[PDB]
Design a protein around this ligand. Structure first.
Ligand SMILES: Cc1cn([C@H]2C[C@H](O)[C@@H](COP(=O)(O)OP(=O)(O)OP(=O)(O)OP(=O)(O)OP(=O)(O)OC[C@H]3O[C@@H](n4cnc5c(N)ncnc54)[C@H](O)[C@@H]3O)O2)c(=O)[nH]c1=O
Ligand SMILES: Cc1cn([C@H]2C[C@H](O)[C@@H](COP(=O)(O)OP(=O)(O)OP(=O)(O)OP(=O)(O)OP(=O)(O)OC[C@H]3O[C@@H](n4cnc5c(N)ncnc54)[C@H](O)[C@@H]3O)O2)c(=O)[nH]c1=O
Ligand SMILES: [Mg+2]
Ligand SMILES: [Mg+2]
Lengths: 208, 208
């Protein structure tokens, strides 16, 4: 089974991916994880973030370029994903294709039914042939509270800092909104909108 | 030996690569070719050109994004290039890293000593570890005459058309200028500035 955890920055995905990765393990089913972007493994992923940190000329100023880099990263991750799906019983992804739709759409003040989202559908699932997730958990958390975790995170870590997207609050809010629309319409597969107080034990029982 | 043929659009590279690929063969040395962008083999190469043909939102509007795609293409071509260098006696490239420097710089009205060119040096040779060519032949042809070949080419072929770069004459002219500066300063390796009337037989005798 292929599960993808989605949500704005500082929402708690990394951790949910941890508490859920353990909930399934307490069930005999082997679990595997992979987080996107694949920093260090994908040059495109690295170039994308460094750009989000102010590098590589006018790169980040192009919504579609930034989207392409995150697609090209995953593209190089197709055999790997499939392998994981074959080997392990469960595979959890910290961010997946839905992220490109949510952020790209939000950057263009478009809604889930917009062109950017449709564009991500066409390039990633259809064209790059990236497997669609059996499940997409939208860890929904207010844009204000989520921003607080992003700010605290940058403050608690010396070699760290929010990027162009995390500094843009209105972007975070619109992405939250689009994430909500995508889940309602079950974009790329079925969605489950949980919360911070979601019980991993059950959530994992739901993911069958 | 690794040779790269460089030059503006409609300069005659594709053909020179042909007349030269045969000149070496008439010398017992095996020859191999590869043309960049690697259409069909590199998604990034395809996304780059389709963008140059008006697709993928605001992609092409970012000089560095377009540059990155052409870099990521070649990146995926590192083991292949090296293999070719090991196997064959001669390897000719229809466009290489110098192209990213020349066009990116020209798009930004920068000169060869500018930031875009230095950026291509840092990312491709240094970072992606793409091998530097023993030779870089700058097939120099007036921007006016070269534009004529691009226009004629699009006219003689039904499923074809000049792209954003080929339609931009001033861009073609500035690229020619920057190509000239790069050759004089021997960017990325040594350069040989020939001409349309260059004798393949000799040119190949020069490439030792
Ligand atoms: C997968 C995906 C993501 N996104 C968007 C969503 C996000 O806004 C953004 C980053 O994706 P992310 O949500 O995983 O979030 P990050 O902040 O990147 O991830 P982390 O949770 O790991 O952040 P940290 O800040 O803890 O960790 P760090 O390791 O410092 O990560 C930052 C990276 O950015 C670059 N970076 C960091 N510091 C840098 C510096 N000083 N100079 C240059 N580059 C720098 C490096 O490449 C580093 O790996 O990408 C999309 O639009 N589409 C997609 O398909
Ligand atoms: C390698 C490199 C190149 N460039 C710049 C230089 C050029 O301005 C431009 C194209 O690179 P090119 O010089 O090889 O030139 P092309 O015109 O791409 O090559 P050809 O000589 O093969 O052109 P043709 O027009 O004969 O052939 P075609 O096969 O039609 O090539 C066009 C491609 O563009 C897309 N395309 C073509 N028609 C399309 C259409 N209708 N809709 C969408 N996309 C379309 C497709 O991906 C196709 O492969 O890229 C850089 O800036 N940096 C680099 O590192
Ligand atoms: Mg982030
Ligand atoms: Mg061309």
């Amino acid at each position: 089974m292929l599960i993808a955890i989605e949500g704005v920055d500082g929402a708690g995905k990394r951790t949910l991916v941890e508490k859920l990765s353990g909930a399934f393990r307490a069930a005999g089913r082997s679990v595997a994880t992979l987080a996107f972007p694949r920093y260090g493994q994908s040059v495109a992923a690295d170039i994308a973030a460094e750009a989000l940190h102010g590098e590589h000329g006018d790169l980040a100023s192009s919504v579609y370029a930034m989207a392409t880099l995150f697609a090209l990263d995953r593209a190089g991750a197709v055999h790997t994903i499939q392998g994981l799906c074959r080997g392990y019983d469960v595979v959890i992804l910290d961010r997946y294709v839905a992220s490109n739709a949510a952020y790209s759409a939000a950057r263009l003040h478009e809604n889930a039914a917009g062109k950017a989202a449709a564009w991500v559908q066409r390039i990633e699932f259809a064209r790059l042939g990236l497997p669609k997730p059996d499940w997409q958990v939208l860890l929904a958390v207010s844009a204000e509270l989520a921003g607080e975790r992003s700010r605290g995170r940058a403050q608690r870590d010396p070699g760290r800092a929010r990027d162009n997207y995390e500094r843009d609050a209105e972007l975070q809010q619109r992405t939250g909104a689009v994430y909500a629309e995508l889940a309602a319409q079950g974009w790329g597969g079925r969605w489950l909108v949980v919360g911070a107080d979601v019980d991993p034990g059950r959530l994992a029982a739901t993911l069958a």
